[PDB]
Design a protein that fits this description.
The complex is a heteropentamer of chains A (about 270), B (about 60), C (about 230), D (about 350) and E (about 230). With about 60 residues, chain B is mainly α. Chain B is about 55% helix and about 0% strand. With about 230 residues, chain E is mainly β. Chain E has two domains: about 1-120, Immunoglobulin-like (Sandwich); about 130-225, Immunoglobulin-like. The chains are: A mainly alpha (about 270), B mainly alpha (about 60), C alpha/beta (about 230), D mainly beta (about 350), E mainly beta (about 230). Chains B and D meet through helix 1 and helix 2 of B and helix 1 and strand 17 of D. Bound molecules: the ligand NC[C@H]1O[C@@H]([C@]23C[C@H]4C[C@H](C[C@H](C4)C2)C3)Cc2c1ccc(O)c2O. It is classed as membrane protein/immune system. The entry lists the keywords Complex, membrane protein.
Chain lengths: ~270, ~60, ~230, ~350, ~230
């Protein structure tokens, strides 16, 4: 199965490289361009930083675990690796949820948007997205409240991880974007009568997250509830789907919108 | 009549502007280029002087 | 900056920047709105309703904890070509039309055409206010001045099915009102590109809920602007 | 009387143009082919000045060559320290539609004006520490489009009333009136000796006015569109002007001529602010197309591309010592370039 | 512009007292203020400094925690909380206004001064060559100041201050940085120094020049004063 190993390594190199380059492009674009210093662009930049750190830290060494079922490093580094993985993934999910909240206040409270969604509130959002996952991962794997490396998930631990890592920044995003879809449909119908892009945009934005992060979380919370029966291969595929969401997130939130595309073209 | 008064004012303005001393275009061009070349030494934008004397370093 | 004089200068600059941050918070929460019209249109009674050679008659009014700024240009000449790009980032432009005159109506229509098609005033929506509807109703019911005397297209005009009148009103008045609205609507929809929108309204000088209409229209304008920015419209 | 008067005025302008053509024999460009062009200049963003909420509409340099004041329609005149980027003053205005600002040559006063119809002069050196309104000059029907100090007690303004006014700060009323412009004047520039000034209106014609006697000394025409920017050549007998037709051009007072037009095919948006370097060899001109081009004033070629602004460039000006040029745009950011 | 101080009186040694300086006629919210003090038989000395927004606050070597400075912007006063009053802490304290932007004139106006009587290295040791000299009026007067360190900075500013307080009244400001002359003082004064030794010249002398002349450094920040040359007629 050497050819299979080589193909998987090539695919994972492709994923790691593309997430790294996309997130670096986004980071430099916001951190350099004076027109892209808006608070929502700060949320985008913090999200891209989270995915860039994820691709730099946890993807390259979770790569070796995949297709080999071995951890070449020690358990001491394994604890920090799992901590950083959980931290950065939950941080990315929280950043997606907070971007959804920002867009909710933008197109649901449009007049009181530039005031309520100021740089201070966005800084608080970034601090929460970086801190709550950090304390969660550190307290759940370092203080022992729960292949080469796999964390033992418990009945309480799995549901806790679902609620505080995926479901809240899940349901919140889902309800927000449902409201956004309803409002955008109403406005588009009104404009057409006074004489769809919104459905496609929200479909992409919600579908990427809900096809990458969702199945992984459903599997990892069904595993402790029922018997601990599952092929070890599926867990690697699902965590790599999460990493692939980290890959696509800069594309969804910065390369989809024409203003950022034009800024990038003006960069070159 | 306001219109005839405005016409008279315009005629007077053009008359006053017309009867003034002119110079050939060559002389004006020559003295402009002479001013440009003579003061080019003290023009920090024409020849970029080293940053040892520019107060806008870095 | 090592010197104490320079350190204190930097600290003074930091205090100035803090004051500028306070001013930025105040200015970013305030929506800027241009007000345009003509003589006897009704801009003055409108601006006094929500409450020398001066040029800007600044007005500030608060609706649902949202601050709106009326920028009325006064004591200035015509040909509003060179000062109109100052209002480039305003939330909207409220255009006031007197719908009773029927002789300055063509001039107001041309002014709306100029404002709507202005190259600088793109990305900026127009909130249209037709005033003196009581006077318009009185004039049309009196029959002193027929519409055909100035607008010949009124004969071949039909009231749209989505035209709701006031509960008690002559339907000739409603037809005239909606024809005058549809003129500006046709100007707006002739070339709008779907980036700025017109919000015609029927109102009078005594109509006190004009700030609420401005609030609703600005809410729709900013909501649509954000939807376009997010590629949702 | 109108019929004969119009024809005689038209004949007078015909004979003026005939004299203009007679005085025109050889153009400046073909005279300046022999001299070596400056070539290409690499000007970089030496400093970026941040703090304006809304877009910047005006800026000016001090005679001290260090401080500069910039106006934004968010109601702030920010007086900076150019080298240290620090803010010396942040004057809040009583009408946030300012398009003009003039830092006094002595540095004591700063002017502003715009849609407010009133030119506000602010004193900077006072017993109490604050920049209070020194005076409020009213009397322009149209919006103030430019203002320039002569000294501490005099200022010349050009307004939207198609008129310019020589003011007097002490009395507070107009001293001289400059009329004769069809369109509204949008910018005036002063001669170094401060005896005459050139103002450019939207009638596609600039005018040279004498401050003292107060009559239109010399009318210059040749533009197709509205004149937005004006600067006066350092020699004292020429000046550049910039219009909406994406073409700027140089005129000479004694020659009474339209010299070379610094026009290029790729640029299509008009000029907004124009200025000369210390020697007059360089001509900087901001454009509505995000660019601030630099032309060789004697070669009519784009001697370098000086982009770097994310919005319309509305301000410009070269430091009195010629060390650097400050460019203010609609991105609400000043940029000092060398 | 009046800097009125309140307090003073006989205070037992080791006690605590609050010295106040009320500011009227000028908004000092943009002013850093200095509590310079006058010993009964010595020269001026600086003890503490509070910024415009109180962001940066510095004290002297002899009094670091024993003194405490406060400013109340709404009340427009300075509060000086002094503790552990030793026999050295006797001085007619002066509250000093100093705005710190480019081209400003710090230490321009000084407080009236309230006497305080009680019962019983990195510091720039800059000394004035002489202490007393009788000079006839009219002809030029030369006063020499010397510093222990070069006062010229990398930015091109060489900080120096001259006061020349008239007998029995608050010190004024003559020259700052020995190149710029204050508004109130006549233009007849001038200064010149290489960076270590400095000289002040007077074109013509009158009864207003009677008094002792002082000399301040500002490059480093101990705010050490000069010995003082007393000019007697
Ligand atoms: N793909 C990110 C993802 O790592 C998982 C891990 C944790 C352990 C190491 C490795 C394989 C197993 C065991 C599953 C990754 C846990 C987790 C993640 C994201 C958010 C979470 O809230 C969370 O608990």
């Amino acid at each position: 199965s050497n050819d299979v190993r080589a193909s998987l390594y090539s695919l994972m190199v492709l994923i790691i490289l593309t997430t790294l380059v996309g997130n670096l492009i986004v980071i430099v674009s916001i951190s350099h361009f004076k027109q892209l210093h808006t608070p929502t662009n700060w949320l985008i930049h913090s999200m891209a930083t989270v995915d860039f750190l994820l691709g730099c830290l946890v993807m390259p060494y979770s790569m070796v675990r995949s297709a080999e079922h071995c951890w070449y490093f020690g358990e001491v580094f394994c604890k920090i690796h799992t901590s950083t993985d959980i931290m950065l993934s939950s941080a990315s999910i929280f950043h997606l949820s907070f971007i959804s909240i920002d867009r909710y206040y933008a197109v649901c409270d449009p007049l009181r948007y530039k005031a309520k969604m100021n740089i201070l509130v966005i800084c608080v959002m970034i601090f929460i997205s970086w801190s709550v996952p950090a304390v969660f991962a550190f307290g759940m794997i370092f203080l022992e409240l729960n292949g080469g490396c796999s964390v033992f998930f418990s009945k309480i631990s799995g549901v806790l991880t679902f609620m505080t890592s995926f479901y809240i920044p899940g349901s919140i995003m889902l309800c927000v974007y449902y409201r956004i879809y309803l409002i955008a449909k109403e406005q588009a119908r009104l404009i057409s009568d006074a004489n769809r892009k919104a459905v496609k945009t929200l479909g992409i934005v919600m579908g990427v997250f809900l096809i990458c992060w969702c199945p992984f979380f459903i599997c990892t919370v069904m595993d402790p509830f029922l018997h601990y029966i599952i092929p070890p291969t599926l867990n690697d595929v699902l965590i790599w789907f999460g990493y692939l969401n980290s890959t696509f997130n800069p594309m969804v939130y910065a390369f989809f919108y024409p203003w950022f595309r034009k800024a990038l073209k003006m960069m070159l | 009549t306001a219109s005839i008064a405005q016409a008279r004012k315009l005629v007077e303005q053009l008359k006053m502007e017309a009867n003034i001393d002119r110079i050939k275009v060559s002389k004006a061009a020559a003295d402009l280029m002479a001013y440009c070349e003579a003061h080019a030494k003290e023009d920090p934008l024409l020849t970029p002087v080293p940053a040892s004397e520019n107060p806008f370093r870095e | 900056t090592l010197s104490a004089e320079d350190k204190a200068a930097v600290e003074r600059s930091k205090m100035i920047e803090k004051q500028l941050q306070k001013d930025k918070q105040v200015y970013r929460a305030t929506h800027r709105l241009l007000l345009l019209g003509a003589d006897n249109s009704g801009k003055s009674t409108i601006v006094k309703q929500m409450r020398k050679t001066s040029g800007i008659f600044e007005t500030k009014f608060q609706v649902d904890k949202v601050n709106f700024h009326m920028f009325d240009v006064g004591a200035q000449r015509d040909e509003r070509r060179k000062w109109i790009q100052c209002f480039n980032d305003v939330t909207a432009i409220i255009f006031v039309v007197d719908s009773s005159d029927y002789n300055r109506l063509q001039e107001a229509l041309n002014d709306f055409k100029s404002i709507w098609n202005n190259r600088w005033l793109r990305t900026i929506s127009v909130i249209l206010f037709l005033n003196k509807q009581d006077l318009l109703a009185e004039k049309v019911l009196a029959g002193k001045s027929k519409i055909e005397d100035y607008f010949p297209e009124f004969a071949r005009y039909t009231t749209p099915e989505d035209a709701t009148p006031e509960p008690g009103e002559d339907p000739r008045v409603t037809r005239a009102k909606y024809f005058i609205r549809d003129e500006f609507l046709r100007i707006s929809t002739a070339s709008g590109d779907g980036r700025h929108y017109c919000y015609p309204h029927f109102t009078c000088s005594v109509d006190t809920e004009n700030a609420r209409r401005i609030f609703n229209d600005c809410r729709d304008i900013i909501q649509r602007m954000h939807l376009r920015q997010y590629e949702l419209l | 009387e109108l019929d004969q008067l119009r024809q005689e005025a038209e004949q007078l302008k015909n004979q003026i143009r005939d004299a203009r053509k007679a005085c025109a024999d050889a153009t400046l460009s073909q005279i300046t082919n022999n001299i070596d062009p400056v070539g290409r200049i690499q000007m970089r963003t030496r400093r970026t000045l941040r703090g304006h909420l809304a877009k910047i509409y005006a800026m000016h340099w001090g005679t001290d060559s260090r401080l500069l004041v910039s106006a934004s329609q968010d109601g702030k005149l920010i007086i900076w320290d150019s080298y240290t980027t620090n803010k010396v003053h942040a004057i809040p205005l009583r009408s946030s539609w300012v398009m003009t600002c003039a830092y006094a040559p002595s540095g004591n006063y700063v002017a502003c004006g715009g849609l407010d119809n009133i030119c506000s002069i602010y004193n900077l050196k006072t017993r109490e520490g604050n920049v209070r309104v020194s005076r409020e000059l009213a009397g322009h029907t149209g919006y103030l489009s430019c203002c320039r100090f002569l000294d501490d007690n005099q200022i010349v303004t050009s307004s939207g009333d198609t008129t310019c006014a020589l003011w007097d700060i002490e009395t507070g009323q107009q001293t001289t009136t400059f009329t004769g412009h069809t369109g509204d004047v949008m910018s005036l520039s002063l001669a170094p000796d401060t005896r005459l000034f050139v103002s450019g209106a939207c009638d596609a014609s600039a005018k040279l006015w004498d401050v003292r006697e107060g009559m239109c000394r010399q009318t210059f025409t040749g533009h197709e569109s509205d004149i937005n920017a004006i600067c006066f050549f350092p020699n004292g007998n020429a000046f550049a002007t910039g219009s909406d037709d994406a073409t700027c051009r140089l005129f000479d007072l004694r020659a009474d001529q339209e010299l070379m037009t610094y026009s290029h095919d790729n640029i299509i948006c008009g000029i907004t602010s124009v200025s000369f370097s210390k020697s007059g060899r360089l001509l900087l001109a901001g454009y509505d197309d995000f660019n601030c081009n630099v032309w060789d004033a004697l070669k009519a070629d784009r001697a370098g591309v000086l982009a770097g602004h994310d919005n319309r460039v509305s301000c410009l000006g070269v430091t009195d010592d010629g060390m650097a040029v400050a460019t203010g745009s609609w991105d609400s950011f000043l940029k000092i370039w060398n | 512009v009046q800097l009125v101080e309140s307090g003073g009186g006989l205070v037992q040694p080791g006690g605590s007292r609050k010295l106040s300086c009320s500011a009227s006629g000028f908004a000092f919210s943009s002013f850093g203020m200095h509590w310079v003090r006058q010993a009964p038989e010595k020269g001026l000395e600086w003890v503490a400094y509070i910024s415009s927004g109180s962001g940066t606050i510095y004290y002297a070597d002899t009094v670091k925690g024993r003194f405490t400075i406060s400013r109340d912007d709404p009340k427009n006063t300075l509060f000086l909380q002094m503790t552990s009053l030793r026999s050295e802490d006797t001085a007619m304290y002066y509250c000093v206004r100093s705005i710190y932007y480019y081209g400003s004139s710090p230490f321009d106006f000084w407080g009236q001064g309230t006497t305080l009587t009680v019962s019983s290295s990195s510091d720039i040791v800059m000394t004035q060559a002489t202490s007393s000299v009788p000079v006839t009026p009219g002809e030029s007067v030369s006063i020499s100041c010397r510093s222990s360190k070069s006062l010229l900075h990398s930015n091109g500013n060489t900080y120096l201050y001259w006061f020349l307080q008239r007998p029995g009244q608050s010190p004024q400001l003559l020259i700052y940085r020995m190149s710029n002359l204050a508004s109130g003082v006549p233009d007849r004064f001038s200064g010149s120094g290489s960076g270590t030794a400095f000289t002040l010249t007077i074109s013509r002398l009158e009864a207003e020049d009677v008094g002792v002349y002082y000399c301040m450094q500002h490059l480093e920040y101990p705010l050490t004063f000069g010995a003082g040359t007393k000019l007697e007629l």
